[PDB]
């Protein structure tokens, strides 16, 4: 059987405004 | 001269979810594509192509090279032994071309930056500081390129005069992106460039120091 | 000194328990073509994330 | 709740000691600290550029040491050379594993 | 026979404007 609780993860979640990328300088 | 070109592939759904959640996927292929041309490019320049007979910098056969000692050794520093090379190597380009042409440029490698910056004994100035008094007219920059010039893992220094009567690149044509070609349920987008590569007309303005 | 020497931050709740971050990636390459051809190659992109507490 | 000396992910420099038993040594705390600039400058392929350094309050002394057959210190010659850096002193750092030991935060 | 294309070699060709002489200082 399945005990969990009435608040899932995602609704306790945040993502953060600012992402990042990487870098490959030309030259 | 030469051509370069690649592309890339994109159906109609992976269009809809980047319209719906707000990042595009087209976008950042474009951008790749443009990258990997600007990166062959380079690679061209600056090492060449042996079954299409291109010759890198580092490769052509009528520049002068001269050997050298390390300028690190037992992670010891020697700036005169620098300082040395580098005079030696300025009055090589003096005395080749018999005072026609003069040098004008240095290029290092980043990693030895620290070796020109140590200051001299008894004194508040650094032999950099020194060696641009003494060479007025001479600017120095250090390459990341130059980390590796034969696939092996050595150094080397490059001094040249930037004019462009010695030596030249050419780009005749530019990234143009032609358009999409449909397909049962997606698409296919080619880009094509031009260009040439380095020509030496000159070659005795350039002095490669290997080893460093 | 541990709040004057780094920087503060309240981009967040005080109801939350988690956050993550995003980031990118791109791989491709280019070949030197004639006119008459059809095989040119492709490229393609990629992410990744991470958390806190 | 990784700490900010004991992260594995960033650089960590090992050195002979800037005061080995009551021998002030300014040549060598001249040398590393340039060291750790050029690191961070190549490890991230430029876009980042070292800004701050934060040193234990009882190695002041090592950069006040006047050099040799000059009239200016160490630290105004490290200031000449690598301007736009600011130096600060921080009283955490005389103590980083609870074993006396000292450390240098670029 | 003679197979050949429409243009030919000097038509899609490029001449430099600009020469080099060797130089000899006197003394």
Redesign the interface.
């Given at each position: 059987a399945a005990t969990m609780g009435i608040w899932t993860a995602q609704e306790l979640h945040r993502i953060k405004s600012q992402s990042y990328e990487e870098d490959y300088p030309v030259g | 001269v030469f051509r370069l070109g690649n592309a890339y592939l994109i159906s109609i759904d992976e269009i809809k979810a980047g319209q719906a959640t707000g990042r595009p996927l087209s976008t950042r292929k474009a951008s790749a594509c443009q990258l990997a041309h600007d990166q062959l490019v380079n690679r061209l320049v600056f090492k060449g192509s042996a079954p299409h007979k291109i010759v890198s910098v580092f490769n052509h056969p009528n520049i002068t090279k001269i050997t050298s000692g390390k300028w690190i050794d037992a992670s010891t520093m020697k700036p005169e032994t620098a300082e040395a090379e580098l005079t030696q190597a300025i009055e090589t380009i003096e005395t080749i071309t018999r005072g026609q042409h003069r040098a004008t440029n240095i290029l290092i490698p980043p990693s030895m930056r620290k070796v020109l910056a140590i200051r001299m004994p008894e004194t508040t100035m650094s032999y950099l500081d020194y060696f641009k008094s003494q060479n007025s007219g001479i600017e120095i920059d250090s390459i990341a390129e130059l980390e590796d010039i034969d696939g092996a893992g050595t150094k080397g220094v490059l001094v040249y005069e930037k004019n462009p009567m010695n030596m030249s690149i050419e780009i005749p044509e530019a990234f143009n992106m032609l358009p999409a070609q449909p397909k049962d349920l997606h698409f296919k987008v080619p880009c094509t460039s031009k260009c040439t590569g380095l020509t030496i007309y000159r070659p005795m303005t350039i002095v490669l120091i290997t080893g460093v | 000194?541990?709040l004057r020497?780094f920087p503060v931050t309240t981009?967040?709740?005080p109801?939350?328990?988690?956050?993550?971050?995003?980031?990118?990636?791109?791989?491709?390459?280019?070949?030197?073509?004639?006119?008459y051809?059809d095989d040119?190659?492709?490229?393609?992109?990629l992410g990744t994330s991470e958390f806190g507490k």
């Open positions: - | - | 000194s541990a020497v981009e967040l709740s109801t939350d328990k988690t956050f993550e971050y995003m980031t990118f990636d791109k791989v491709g390459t280019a070949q030197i073509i004639a006119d051809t040119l190659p492709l490229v393609d992109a």
